[PDB]
Amino acid sequence: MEILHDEDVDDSILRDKTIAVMGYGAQGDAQANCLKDSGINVVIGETEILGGNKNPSWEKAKEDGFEVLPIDKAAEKGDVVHILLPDEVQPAIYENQIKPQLKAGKALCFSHGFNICFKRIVPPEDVDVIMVAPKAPGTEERKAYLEGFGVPGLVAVKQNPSGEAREVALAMTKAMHWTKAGILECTFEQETYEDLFGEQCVLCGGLVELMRNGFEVLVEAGYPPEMAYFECVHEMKLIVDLVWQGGIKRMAEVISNTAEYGMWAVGHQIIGPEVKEKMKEALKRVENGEFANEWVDEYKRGIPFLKASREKMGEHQVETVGAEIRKLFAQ
Amino acid sequence: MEILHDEDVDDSILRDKTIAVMGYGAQGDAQANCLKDSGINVVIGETEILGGNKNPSWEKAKEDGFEVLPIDKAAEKGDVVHILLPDEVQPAIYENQIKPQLKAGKALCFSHGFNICFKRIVPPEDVDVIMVAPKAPGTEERKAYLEGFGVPGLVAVKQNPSGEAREVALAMTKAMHWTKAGILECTFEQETYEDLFGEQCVLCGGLVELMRNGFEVLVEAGYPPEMAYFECVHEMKLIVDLVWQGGIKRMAEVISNTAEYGMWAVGHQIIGPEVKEKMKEALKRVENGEFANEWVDEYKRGIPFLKASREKMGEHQVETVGAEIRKLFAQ
Ligand SMILES: NC(=O)C1=CN([C@@H]2O[C@H](COP(=O)(O)OP(=O)(O)OC[C@H]3O[C@@H](n4cnc5c(N)ncnc54)[C@H](O)[C@@H]3O)[C@@H](O)[C@H]2O)C=CC1
Ligand SMILES: NC(=O)C1=CN([C@@H]2O[C@H](COP(=O)(O)OP(=O)(O)OC[C@H]3O[C@@H](n4cnc5c(N)ncnc54)[C@H](O)[C@@H]3O)[C@@H](O)[C@H]2O)C=CC1
Ligand SMILES: CC(C)N(O)C(=O)C(=O)O
Ligand SMILES: CC(C)N(O)C(=O)C(=O)O
Ligand SMILES: [Mg+2]
Ligand SMILES: [Mg+2]
Ligand SMILES: [Mg+2]
Ligand SMILES: [Mg+2]
Ligand SMILES: [Mg+2]
Ligand SMILES: [Mg+2]
Incomplete structure (x- = not known):
């Protein structure tokens, strides 16, 4: 359109x-x-x-x-x-x-x-x-x-x-x-559904869970958390900027051939069909009012899930180690 | 450390x-x-x-x-x-x-x-x-x-x-x-493994498969590809910039409470424990020389998978519509 x-x-x-x-x-x-x-x-x-x-x-x-x-x-x-x-x-x-x-x-x-x-x-x-x-x-x-x-x-x-x-x-x-x-x-409805979907599945829910899971896998395997932070979080901005400027095409040109191969060989093994089906299910719940009913009821009950999730977010090592690293930047 | x-x-x-x-x-x-x-x-x-x-x-x-x-x-x-x-x-x-x-x-x-x-x-x-x-x-x-x-x-x-x-x-x-x-x-071995993992699972494979699958879900449900682009790709840079600056904490402060609720309620339903387990498996293949042997063999064969992947990437709607969108920006 x-x-x-x-x-x-x-x-x-x-x-x-x-x-x-x-x-x-x-x-x-x-x-x-x-x-x-x-x-x-x-x-x-x-x-x-x-x-x-x-x-x-x-x-x-x-x-x-x-x-x-x-x-x-x-x-x-x-x-x-x-x-x-x-x-x-x-x-x-x-x-x-x-x-x-x-x-x-x-x-x-x-x-x-x-x-x-x-x-x-x-x-x-x-x-x-x-x-x-x-x-x-x-x-x-x-x-x-x-x-x-x-x-x-x-x-x-x-x-x-x-x-x-x-x-x-x-x-x-x-x-x-x-x-x-x-x-x-x-239409009002279209914007509502796409927007709820994107923030939940891609931009906020998807992004944060992707970075957090990667970070955890490295730390649990014995890699230093600072190293996991630099790899999984700090560098994300730099890679995303290339996509924003020139699409996957530009990003794929700049990263190594090793990385580009890894991207295509392994990325879909991590984020595969099951993820896409879970996305479909979330979109259905957006479209059919189930998610809206949940959020309205959450607010009516004094947002206890949201409050607890905020407290737990701040305790995660990605957040404590990230805050320490960013505070030490010469920026 | x-x-x-x-x-x-x-x-x-x-x-x-x-x-x-x-x-x-x-x-x-x-x-x-x-x-x-x-x-x-x-x-x-x-x-x-x-x-x-x-x-x-x-x-x-x-x-x-x-x-x-x-x-x-x-x-x-x-x-x-x-x-x-x-x-x-x-x-x-x-x-x-x-x-x-x-x-x-x-x-x-x-x-x-x-x-x-x-x-x-x-x-x-x-x-x-x-x-x-x-x-x-x-x-x-x-x-x-x-x-x-x-x-x-x-x-x-x-x-x-x-x-x-x-x-x-x-x-x-x-x-x-x-x-x-x-x-x-x-060590040389530590860098090698974390780097390979990060690009495969998070920064390049994970990121691109996350955005692509989101974009496909929207388009397959009848939302315009231009809409799916702005939601799943163009906005990702703006969100990741917040995380880069101030962690998940900063980002969660700036997004709406609706989105913050969605992030915690739904994100982990999309990218969950099954994804983490795939990540562990990918890290093991990096650490044990399987991936490295596959990439060597791919190169020795004339990179046919990487060539096929490049070609198909450039035919995806996210790329053709994104290119058309980005050409029409007025900075
Ligand atoms: N930003 C990135 O691309 C990052 C790369 N690395 C690492 O940096 C090293 C360099 O990677 P890139 O800069 O991506 O290399 P590149 O793919 O940009 O290649 C560098 C140059 O090598 C030459 N070249 C290409 N193919 C050749 C051939 N068959 N024979 C002779 N010369 C050839 C070309 O002039 C090319 O510009 C690698 O070890 C990589 O893993 C590390 C961090 C990030
Ligand atoms: N960047 C974002 O945060 C985006 C937000 N939206 C939409 O923009 C609209 C506004 O969202 P935000 O800017 O995040 O709102 P916000 O959460 O920043 O709230 C705006 C102001 O409302 C006031 N407020 C807060 N709770 C209140 C209460 N209980 N009673 C009276 N006033 C109160 C405060 O002074 C607050 O600064 C929403 O419809 C949202 O979905 C759309 C695009 C992006
Ligand atoms: C993501 C990418 C730039 N990266 O960090 C690499 O290690 C690579 O290009 O191999
Ligand atoms: C990701 C976020 C900024 N967004 O687009 C929203 O719609 C939200 O905050 O509700
Ligand atoms: Mg939005
Ligand atoms: Mg929103
Ligand atoms: Mg190259
Ligand atoms: Mg790297
Ligand atoms: Mg690399
Ligand atoms: Mg808020």
Whole structure:
């Protein structure tokens, strides 16, 4: 399918418009600053006190030069109400702090399709509902913008009572320079499923488990953990950069013939058919709502699995030895 | 285990030594230029004509301002004869072109232990035998050096009849700035096995099979290949950059809580204990000489598996669509 770039998109429609960016975290910080840098009027909706403490994201937004309002006041003010809060808390915050401020002619915007896809938020009929979803972590998205490039993005329109929903959504992507990498138009559901799949199976789940297992195999065989860290973790960035630049082709050219042979002779013995079938099963659970139900129930129960996994992550030798090695860099 | 940095190593021994770099490819080009930039005297040993045509590596090294000799004359001139030719061709080139020029107390150096470890090259008793092995592809090694940093390295000594083998090896890594990231001392056999394992199971085989299988799963489920590319390949660099900078801890902080939950809930279902067991098996074939014999036999046969693999790689959709996408970026 077709990829839209700067040459395809008009950003003019944003001249008269205020974007209320709700949540100043990984995506909200990046997107609000890219938007502001591009001359768009932005206000931040944030919560001053969370769990009984000062919310550092409220203080940061202020310090970074934004108008910062309570979410309800931001919503009143925004022509686009762009929800960059954690997915698990959006439905409550939406019901309670956003919805009463919606009015015909506002657009409700997201950067992930989850809450609309799975019907955890069902907006009123007379608001536009759009998605601008970056295929990037927010910190790296901001740096791409600052380097004169951008990250790829997916754009979706669920409701269009204004007639202008698509044009607004695309214009935002252009203002954020995501068009420099490329935009794909899709549905809320499509983005939801691919994105859950990729993070679980490839980018976060897959990557981390691959590196951790390799690291463990070396250490359990008697290799020093520092050596396992350099081989399995530090060098991953250097190899991935070659793929990002020129595909497998470029990476395969630069590595030794020994390594290239090993890649093809042995890689598929490690990550074989069984992995691909497990990926299929995970994708099914994404598509059919089972994974969504699990995550909603997890959050309802006070995220005990997530809390325990975070504590266990930090105890792993890959993390303790990595932190010691990186702290000793002359960088 | 001790990691050596800049303050731990003295490179002054290289002051009156000439390094003959044999092969000006990914490693020879990077290493030669880092050494030359640090003020070390380097000569290139290369072959003017390969397969009946002008060898571009010969020309490039002339163009980059080196003295470029046939391998035999380069070996004569070098105090350090540093073999950065493809592993599979070193034994014949060593026997024919290098070995007769070896004199007592020269140092024979490698950047991978394979040929010494598996006894494909058996050096005379009266030369030092050293290894300076960067944990990095050569293009990214050169970039790190130009950026004021360095790549991690492994340093081994197999023979030390001069007494100065270790000092020379370490000095080389400091002059190439690898000490800025850090150097580990190890044996030739240790480097060989960890290196082979890492490229097979994690960095090249594992990484490429992980991304390819994810990409296929999406495309086979009806998602556009451009979408599968941005999700499974382009974003991988952005994620791995976080891990490289601050470990899994940093990455987990930046991704969404939805993604962090997915990572821990689902990742190990994709890449699980069965994968770890395959990794153990692959490591055993590396340690026991099976892999090494297969790669020798493959080369002796005219690399038909590697040729067939190259061809099929370049026909995969991940490669053809990725190339089309990357051509359309606007940096
Ligand atoms: N880079 C990423 O993290 C990516 C995120 N997404 C999507 O972007 C959206 C935002 O995600 P993130 O930036 O990771 O959010 P985040 O986890 O950084 O949260 C944003 C801000 O929400 C506030 N917040 C946190 N918990 C709260 C609560 N209980 N009540 C009120 N406010 C609270 C905090 O000030 C926080 O800084 C999500 O829909 C996510 O799926 C899309 C692409 C990538
Ligand atoms: N980045 C990498 O590619 C890494 C390589 N290594 C090791 O470095 C050493 C060098 O590997 P690479 O740089 O990949 O070598 P390469 O494959 O780039 O070969 C170096 C040069 O050797 C010459 N050459 C090629 N075939 C030849 C033949 N049949 N006869 C004569 N000369 C020939 C060509 O001019 C070529 O540029 C190996 O021991 C390898 O395991 C170590 C770390 C990483
Ligand atoms: C990997 C990560 C940045 N990502 O793309 C996400 O969609 C997420 O954080 O949810
Ligand atoms: C991954 C690759 C660059 N590597 O570290 C090697 O050992 C190789 O190219 O053989
Ligand atoms: Mg994503
Ligand atoms: Mg996501
Ligand atoms: Mg090659
Ligand atoms: Mg290696
Ligand atoms: Mg190798
Ligand atoms: Mg979080």
